[PDB]
Structures are given as structure tokens and as C-alpha cells.
Design a protein around this ligand. Structure first.
Ligand SMILES: [K+]
Ligand SMILES: [K+]
Ligand SMILES: [K+]
Ligand SMILES: [K+]
Ligand SMILES: [K+]
Ligand SMILES: [K+]
Ligand SMILES: [K+]
Ligand SMILES: [K+]
Ligand SMILES: [K+]
Ligand SMILES: [K+]
Ligand SMILES: [Mg+2]
Ligand SMILES: [Mg+2]
Ligand SMILES: [Mg+2]
Ligand SMILES: [Mg+2]
Ligand SMILES: [Mg+2]
Ligand SMILES: [Mg+2]
Ligand SMILES: [Mg+2]
Ligand SMILES: [Mg+2]
Ligand SMILES: [Mg+2]
Lengths: 159, 167, 300
RNA sequence: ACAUACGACCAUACCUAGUGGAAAACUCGGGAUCCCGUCCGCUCUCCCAUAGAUAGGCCACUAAGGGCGGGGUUAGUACUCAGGUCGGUGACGACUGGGGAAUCCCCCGUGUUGUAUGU
RNA sequence: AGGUGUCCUAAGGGGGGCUCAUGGAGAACAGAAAUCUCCAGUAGAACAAAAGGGUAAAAGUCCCCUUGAUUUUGAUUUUCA
RNA sequence: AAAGCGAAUGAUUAGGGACUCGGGGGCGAUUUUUAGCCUUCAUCCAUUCUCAAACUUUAAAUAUGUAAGAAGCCCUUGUUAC
């Protein structure tokens, strides 16, 4: 049985970067969170209270509780042949709102106006994404862009 | 030049390093207390060397500082004993200087046989008006390059005011 | 010789501090505890009463904090006391009490709670706190703010607590204890409640006048030059401030005009742009180097 | 546009040296009765806004300045995922379908901005 | 390559002021090394102990007041069935 | 992984410039710090040849967390001891 402590193996993960020590920006304490938000976890080494375990560093979850100085988050952990639901308490210095769902929240309101604009006008539109398609036919002119002929080069010693 | 670039005496501090504790230190404190009129301050020993016979955290010295007209008159008396002659190397690169004497009764203190005889050290600090910039608590900053004193200026000031000689 | 500490490698690894800490203006350790609010209360603001002192002025504000900067809710300077009968001693304890009272009335009027929450109206040196007022058979809690003192020392008798005492009598609720007011005896832990009354109306200045005039007439007239030119004596200061107090609680939005030059916003911009020097260009900067080479080369 | 108070990003803002600063502001500044604190009214605290000066703090400009920030070159190179009854005694290497860096060196730049009150 | 079966009424809790290791230049005895003064100084010091992380108007250092090292039970995290 | 050391911490080869009061040896009277004439190590400065599982300013490939709607989006306004 090897050594297995709470913070074993976190030499580089929990460290602050080069030229990024000292004071914490105060906009961290001014954000607001609501039950149902989507946040990601990133441990700050300079705060030793409300720290999450090293497994959750770099994960994304959903808020389920709000208290005076922390939030409760729900994450799913894989243990061999199943998933288990975990609930962790994290101080707000370690959490951050996520941009994972912003693309979806932007397409939903853009689809609403395009649908209503088209319905008012009378011409149908697409309203869903498509993967990149193969290119089409086109003509390329040789005028004042004459091609340059290349050939492989002989071997030579550099040093 | 500008009226705000005139030299003056910031403070004068004198210390006596007896090297041991006991009655000798107490009597070394009385001479400074009588001379200045203020209560002096004891200084302990940071190191511990058996060659000098001192250990950590035992008082071995006494000092005190004065400002204003009191500093000027006491500085005058010491220069009188030194008969207004000083060495060039007594002046530092920041614009200060100092000297010392081997006997405290030379100034004239009505010698008492029950207090012994001590020597002391003289050191005074020069300055200019507007030095509060680097000393205030709020918006503390750094004095400019053209506003600081040099060795040539302070020796010249000493020769004009006290009419002394430095070589 | 010795190693040069400040070489290029020293500069490369150097990490600067926050800009307003380099300027020495804000204490970020205290600021965090002042502005942060419980996440249980989602968007309820926290109101700060900041007070700052200059050589010739007193600055007072009511502030809230946002993500991209602070927002000012009201302001009340000390030079604005001129249009109330006060012209001297603009940075003393009595002026601090008056300019604090001005902001409290100016804030309550903006919120619409001026008719209720009057305050004290008879400045007395007692220790009281603003209570809830009963209206239409119901209670309403008073407006609440906290003091922000900056880098000043909080010793007994400081002028920062003078501004607070005025705002508290103005009608705002500001939590505090009385062990920092002038006239508090730390030995018996009692407040005299009369020395504080003297300080509210500026009585400590007046007693200085009469004592100084009796024992040193030359210093008296050199330090109170502008006080005597307007026939202000030691028996008139108390009624002078009490007059300003009741005028302030009748029209807190009175306008003041100074004797400095007056222009418009567009006029000032045109004036300032004339005294402005522009940076060189690349061609000019290169031509200067070429000229410098010719000078040094021909200098030999 | 300029100044002050409270800020946001936290060096394009830092460090060194040299020249300038309309108006107002900010500053240095003057005095220790009271509140208060020191070995010392140096710092902190109180009183005056008259007198003096932009000397310094503060703002702006300069320097083939050190650092910092952005880009080029290094280079389709080093490395790496998948493949073959491929080469070679081996060490190790080439090819097929893909992904793809970092110094030395060269060029440019030297803060942006929110609320409130004023010049 | 190393560590543990302890140690602390403060080396626990709150508040306030200050800045460290080291270098240069100066001062009677005093010198390589005693005490005093100025300038530079991104932490090169200190934080009971092994090593790693963290900290500059502090988490270091000195000063003032105290016992949240207290009461009643539940939820959650690591090793994990 | 690769890369770096005219970048911090460590390891490491060689010349040059500045220096004397740091040391050593000496030569003009060893006179003498007279830094007189040299001299070698030492120190500082700009360069120079090689390195790191328990070093690092930088930094891949392969792998890895979350999302891609009806239990969604928008307008108005009812309860509470928070
Ligand atoms: K192990
Ligand atoms: K100036
Ligand atoms: K100037
Ligand atoms: K032990
Ligand atoms: K304690
Ligand atoms: K450590
Ligand atoms: K357990
Ligand atoms: K590299
Ligand atoms: K190295
Ligand atoms: K991904
Ligand atoms: Mg392990
Ligand atoms: Mg703990
Ligand atoms: Mg504080
Ligand atoms: Mg440059
Ligand atoms: Mg392969
Ligand atoms: Mg096969
Ligand atoms: Mg403590
Ligand atoms: Mg502290
Ligand atoms: Mg490698």
C-alpha cells in the first residue's frame, strides 16, 4: 500500500503560474450564481478553505445550492461499471461561470427571430446546422500569375 | 537658486557602546539623559560572540536623537572640541557625516567622581524641504534625482556655516 | 567588486503589483471585506460612505460596487458650505459634521424617504442610533450604510468619525460604538456628552482664539488673519453653525458658484488641446539618429 | 481635452537618465491650546488656507535605453497517432494516410476604460 | 531520496503599526565579526518538524484584548463494498 | 515527447577587458600602498564549449469534462414566517 494523501500528486496542478502570485482580483467575489447554473471548477492554490478534491479540478457541473460564501455542485463520476452522482461544496474562489452553453443560448434566440421574420414575409428558411460540404467548380486565371516550376534539390553538408 | 533647495539639519543622534550591562550602562545612560534632557533608549545585542563577552538579548548600548535648535547647539559644542577640523573621508555619498570624542567631561559637565568617564559618537543627517514625500503613509513615493544631496555640496555647506576646514 | 543586483534577469522576473497599490491609494485587504456580500442575498447592494481629506477640502460620497467599476449615488463636498454662511475653517471638526449632514439629507431626498426619518434636529453630544419609523400602522426599516475610512488612523477624536456623526443625525443608520468620539475617557469607559457637544458647534476653535489672544497677541493675528477681517469672534461660531444646520434641512440642493474662470465643456476642450505635445514619427526619429552620428563623427 | 475621488483590466502601466508644465485642482508648506501618540509633534493626531515655490511628488515629451506586449523566421523542421511477410547482424532508419512545436536572430508598439464633481 | 507514534495557553481567535535575507557608503576605543545613520533591495528571509505548495499595509514581525481547543444534532468529500 | 541555459535553481570548458589593496611571489633605495616596475590566483563585466528521473521561462501528438431544446423560449401577475 503506497502513500495516498489528499493532495498527493498536485505539485504542478495546484500551483499558481509564473508571475501570477499575490493579490486575487476582486471581480471574483462580485459574481452571482443561481440554482441551475453551469460552472466549471478550477482550484486556486492561495485559498486553503472550501477546497475540492483533485479529481474535480477541471470538471464541469450544475449548481444545486447557494449559501453565504459557497455553492453546491453536482458531478458524475465513473467507478468501473457505472456512474455515481457526487455533491461537493466549493468556495466561490474556485468556481467560474462556463461558456459551454452560450452557443446554444445564442442560436435559440436567433432562430426565434428568423422564424418569425420568415413567417411574416413568406419564404422558408433552414434553421439547423450542416457539416462542411465539398467545394464547387470554379475557374482560375493564369493572367499575370504565371506558374513557377520547382524541382528537388541535391544533397549537401551544412556544418 | 530656488528657495526650496536649501540644506538644513534633519536630526542629530549620539550613541555610547559600552559593551556590557550593569552599573556602567546605567551611568552611561545618565550622561546622555542629562545632556539631551530626554530619556535615552537601550539597544540589545543581535549576535553572540564570546570574544567580546556578549550574548543575545542583553543591553550593551545607549543612544538618543535630537532635532531643531537643540541639535544645532550640541553639534556646535562637539565641533568646538574638534576645533572645527574634520577629515574628508568623514562625509558619505548620501551627504552626511560624523565624528567622535574620547571623553564626555571635555564639554564641561562638572565632573562627578561617582559616574566615571565615557566617550560618545556624533552623527547628523542632512536634508532638504519636501522630504515628507518618502515618509508619509499615504501616496508614499521616491524623491527625485535632482533633489538629493551629494558629497561636494555638504562639505561646502560645512565650510561656509561653521568656517571650519576639511583639508 | 560586487554583483549588480538590478540586471536584465532581475527585470525579466519582476512582477508588479496592482496599479493603485503602487500609487498607494487603496487597501485591497480591507476592500474585499467591505464590498463582498453573501450569495444568499443575490443582487442587494452594499452602500459605502467614503470620506477623504485634502489640504483644503473634505470629500464625501455614497458608493456601490459593480463588476466593471464603482457607481456614485450622491456626493457632498466641503467647499459647498460657502452658500450656507460658512467661509473659514473648511477642514475642521465642525465643518466635517456639517458636510456629513448635507449628504445624509441629499441621499434621503433622492430615495424619497425625506419626510419620515428626520433625524435629531437638535445636535446633542449623545450616543443614539436611527430606529425604524412607524407609518400607516406598519414599520419601515431605515436606510443602512457603512463607513469606509481608507488609510486614515482610527484614533479617539479623529475627523472621520465626525462625518459619521453628522450623517447619523441626518437620518441614516450607521452602526458604531461611542468609544472613538472626542470626550471619551478610556479609564472609566464613560462619555462626557458635553465635550462632544462643544466639538459639534466648533467650540474647541473658539476657546483657542480667546486663549491665544490673551497670551500671544502676535501669533493670534498671524494665524487668524481671515477670521478677524470678517468680524468673526469666539461668541458667534455656535450660532453660525446652528444657522447652517437648519438651512441645510430646508434646501439641500442649493447651488454654489465659484470665482474661477468659466467656460463651456467644448470651450475647455479646445483650450486644453493647444497645450499638448505630440509624439515624434518614425521618420523623424530615424532622421535624428542620422544627424547625431554626423555630429559625433565630425566632433573628432 | 485637463484635474480630483472611488474603481476595472493588472508593466503597451515597471526600472534608469534628461528636458518642459495655460486655468483650476493636488502637493510641498505654517503653528502645538484642545483630542491623540512618540527617546524625538520624524510618523500618527489637532489648528490656519494667509505668506512662499513649481524644487520635489503628479502630468507630458526625449533615449538606434534595460525589460515587457504583438508579429516574422526557425519550419512543414523536431516530435507524435495508425500501417506493411519494409531496409539493416545490430544500433537504428526510410516510406504510406494524418496532426504539428520552442530558442538564437529580425520588425513594430509603450496603456485602455466606467461612475460622479469641476477647470 | 526521505518522514510519523510527538510538540504548543500559545506556536489557538480578533485588531493595529511596521518590513525581511543581503550589498554599498559612513562613525572614539571597535578590528573579518559588538552599537548608531543613509541608500539599494520580488522575497533570494521567516512560518515547531520530512518534502512539495502558499503568503509582503501578511499567513512574517512587535504591541493590546481574550478562550470558537465551548453546546445540540443531521448533510457532504478522500481511501471505499 | 520535443525545447532552454549570451533565462531562475544546480552542473561545467576556455580565452579577453577592468581592476589592488583581496592574497602570493617578487624588481627601481624589499624603503615605503610609492595601487612606482611588474607579476600569478581571486573578484566584477561583455563573450564562449557541453548537460538534468526527483530543474525550468515555453510547450505538442494521442487521450479527457460539459453542451447541441417542448422537463425549451418569451409577455403579464398569485403565496411566503426567507
Ligand atoms: K512513495
Ligand atoms: K512640481
Ligand atoms: K522641473
Ligand atoms: K515527533
Ligand atoms: K494569537
Ligand atoms: K515550502
Ligand atoms: K470515512
Ligand atoms: K524552450
Ligand atoms: K543554467
Ligand atoms: K474537447
Ligand atoms: Mg503516488
Ligand atoms: Mg484549518
Ligand atoms: Mg484595517
Ligand atoms: Mg526596448
Ligand atoms: Mg509508428
Ligand atoms: Mg497486421
Ligand atoms: Mg495575530
Ligand atoms: Mg495582520
Ligand atoms: Mg527531454
Amino acid at each position: 500500500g503506497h502513500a495516498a494523501g489528499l493532495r498527493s500528486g498536485t505539485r504542478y496542478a495546484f500551483s499558481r503560474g509564473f508571475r501570477k502570485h499575490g493579490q486575487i482580483p476582486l471581480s471574483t467575489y462580485l459574481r452571482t450564481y443561481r440554482v441551475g447554473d453551469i460552472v466549471d471548477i478550477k482550484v486556486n492554490g492561495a485559498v486553503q478553505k472550501g477546497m475540492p478534491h483533485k479529481f474535480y479540478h477541471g470538471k464541469t457541473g450544475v449548481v444545486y445550492n447557494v449559501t453565504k460564501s459557497a455553492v453546491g455542485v453536482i458531478v458524475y463520476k465513473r467507478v468501473k461499471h457505472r456512474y455515481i452522482e457526487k455533491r461537493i461544496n466549493v468556495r466561490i474562489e474556485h468556481v467560474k461561470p462556463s461558456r459551454s452553453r452560450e452557443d446554444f443560448l445564442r442560436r435559440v434566440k436567433e432562430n426565434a427571430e428568423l422564424k418569425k421574420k420568415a413567417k411574416a414575409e413568406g419564404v422558408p428558411v433552414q434553421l439547423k446546422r450542416q457539416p462542411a460540404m465539398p467545394r464547387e467548380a470554379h475557374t482560375v486565371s493564369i493572367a499575370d500569375n504565371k506558374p513557377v516550376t520547382l524541382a528537388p534539390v541535391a544533397y549537401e553538408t551544412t556544418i | 537658486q530656488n528657495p526650496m533647495r536649501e540644506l538644513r539639519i534633519q536630526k542629530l543622534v549620539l550613541n555610547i557602546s559600552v559593551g556590557e550591562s550593569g552599573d556602567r550602562l546605567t551611568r552611561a545612560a545618565k550622561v546622555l539623559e542629562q545632556l539631551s534632557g530626554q530619556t535615552p533608549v537601550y539597544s540589545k545585542a543581535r549576535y553572540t560572540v564570546r570574544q567580546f563577552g556578549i550574548r543575545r538579548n542583553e543591553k550593551i548600548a545607549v543612544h538618543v536623537t535630537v532635532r531643531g535648535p537643540k541639535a544645532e547647539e550640541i553639534l556646535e559644542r562637539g565641533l568646538k572640541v574638534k576645533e572645527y577640523e574634520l577629515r574628508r573621508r568623514n562625509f558619505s555619498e548620501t551627504g552626511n557625516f560624523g565624528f567622535g570624542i574620547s571623553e564626555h567631561i571635555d564639554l564641561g559637565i562638572k565632573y562627578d567622581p561617582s559616574i566615571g568617564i565615557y566617550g560618545m559618537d556624533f552623527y547628523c543627517c542632512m536634508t532638504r524641504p519636501g522630504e515628507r514625500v518618502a515618509k508619509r503613509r499615504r501616496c508614499k513615493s521616491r524623491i527625485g534625482a535632482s533633489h538629493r544631496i551629494t558629497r561636494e555640496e555638504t562639505i561646502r555647506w560645512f565650510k561656509q556655516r561653521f568656517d571650519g576646514i576639511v583639508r | 567588486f560586487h554583483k549588480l543586483v538590478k540586471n536584465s534577469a532581475y527585470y525579466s522576473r519582476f512582477q508588479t503589483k496592482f496599479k493603485r497599490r503602487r500609487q498607494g491609494k487603496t487597501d485591497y485587504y480591507a476592500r474585499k471585506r467591505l464590498i463582498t456580500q453573501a450569495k444568499n442575498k443575490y443582487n442587494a447592494p452594499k452602500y459605502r460612505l467614503v470620506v477623504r481629506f485634502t489640504n483644503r477640502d473634505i470629500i464625501t460620497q455614497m458608493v456601490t460596487s459593480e463588476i466593471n467599476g464603482d457607481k456614485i449615488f450622491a456626493a457632498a463636498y466641503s467647499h459647498e458650505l460657502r452658500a450656507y454662511g460658512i467661509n473659514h475653517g473648511l477642514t475642521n471638526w465642525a465643518a466635517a459634521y456639517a458636510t456629513g449632514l448635507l449628504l445624509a439629507r441629499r441621499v434621503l431626498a433622492k430615495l424619497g424617504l425625506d419626510k419620515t426619518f428626520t433625524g435629531v434636529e437638535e445636535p446633542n453630544g449623545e450616543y443614539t442610533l436611527t430606529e425604524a419609523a412607524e407609518t400607516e400602522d406598519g414599520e419601515r426599516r431605515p436606510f443602512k450604510a457603512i463607513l469606509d475610512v481608507g488609510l486614515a488612523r482610527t484614533s479617539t477624536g479623529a475627523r472621520v468619525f465626525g462625518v459619521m456623526k453628522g450623517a447619523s443625525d441626518g437620518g441614516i443608520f450607521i452602526p458604531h460604538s461611542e468609544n472613538r468620539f472626542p470626550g471619551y475617557d478610556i479609564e472609566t469607559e464613560e462619555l462626557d456628552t458635553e465635550v462632544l457637544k462643544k466639538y459639534i458647534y466648533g467650540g474647541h476653535v473658539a476657546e483657542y482664539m480667546e486663549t491665544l489672544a490673551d497670551d500671544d497677541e502676535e501669533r493670534y493675528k498671524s494665524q487668524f488673519v481671515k477670521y478677524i477681517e470678517d468680524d468673526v469672534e469666539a461668541d458667534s461660531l455656535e450660532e453660525l453653525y446652528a444657522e447652517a444646520h437648519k438651512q441645510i434641512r430646508a434646501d439641500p440642493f442649493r447651488k454654489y458658484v465659484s470665482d474661477a474662470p468659466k467656460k463651456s465643456k467644448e470651450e475647455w476642450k479646445a483650450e486644453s488641446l493647444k497645450y499638448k505635445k505630440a509624439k515624434l514619427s518614425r521618420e523623424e526619429r530615424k532622421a535624428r539618429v542620422e544627424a547625431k552620428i554626423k555630429q559625433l563623427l565630425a566632433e573628432q
